[PDB]
Design a binder for this molecule. Sequence first.
Ligand SMILES: CS(=O)(=O)Nc1ccc(F)c(F)c1
Length: 366
Amino acid sequence: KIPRGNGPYSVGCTDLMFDHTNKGTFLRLYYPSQRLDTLWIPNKEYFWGLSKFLGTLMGNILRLLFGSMTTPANWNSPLRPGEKYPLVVFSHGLGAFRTLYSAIGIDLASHGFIVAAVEHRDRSASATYYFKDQSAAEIGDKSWLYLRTLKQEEETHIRNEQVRQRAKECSQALSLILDIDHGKPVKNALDLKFDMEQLKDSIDREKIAVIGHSFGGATVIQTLSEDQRFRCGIALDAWMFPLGDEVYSRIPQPLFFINSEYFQYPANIIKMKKCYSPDKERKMITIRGSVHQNFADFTFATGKIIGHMLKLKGDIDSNVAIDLSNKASLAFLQKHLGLHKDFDQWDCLIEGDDENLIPGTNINTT
Ligand SMILES: CS(=O)(=O)Nc1ccc(F)c(F)c1
């Protein structure tokens, strides 16, 4: 029940791992393509990891419920040729992994973006895998890495080291895609029926953005601070705790905060406002009635009553919420990447001009 893209392009999806180690890049790619058959959560170990994240055999139950659920993109469909596409690198939240934000990835793709959804190896993912050597990769002998749980004494330090690794992973993902764009040969550690040589000369190398949710929102900010190739960033309900104090004044690129209503709190909002400066471009909106999970795919995976019970759904309808976030995002991207599309029709959303939006936030700080 993950919504199809609202844009004119049809959408393909594939996975890329290169190199095969846990120091390499692992990403899910959404792209304009030339069957809506992509497996949403493709391995049992992801369900085990989700169970550990939830602190709960619970894993096998999740598996039975969601294990064959699909997401509306055409698996390994060829790339739509004849044009250069802007690129979004997307960063997932704590306890997530690369496949859980397909509602966003597929909608951006359907509007003509290539979206690289990275899977982080910083031990923030519920689960991820790699191969210990080429021989392991050849027979698909995966080595799994589960979420690390932290002592309270550890949190400050380890979360910051993690957000630094995440930013390095977004930069490495970008460097890989750009290298491929100029013809670098890559051997996908996953043996999939999509030729990465398709991506040669298909990226608009000047129109690069980073987007992310929660832990991924802090990753947006660390990445912008560290990598000037990214031209703008969109932080979806950023969890600001991982960031060091020094970074807040070191973000030159335009930055858009799109918040849920119920996730936010003063300690977090204050850090967002520390990013502000008269000489820099900053916007913020809050989606009325929304919760933290409105930005991820599980908001579409259950019915309304169960969803509200488990806080996967807010008072606002899930499709309406994600549509608002996606349209405001597209308008911001058009403005600060210099796109030649008609997304500026939603410029009003950036300013929070809608029944279901608040300009800035309703939380007040000094
Ligand atoms: C708390 S979070 O939203 O940032 N990460 C997350 C963790 C598990 C999920 F199933 C999911 F959809 C998202």
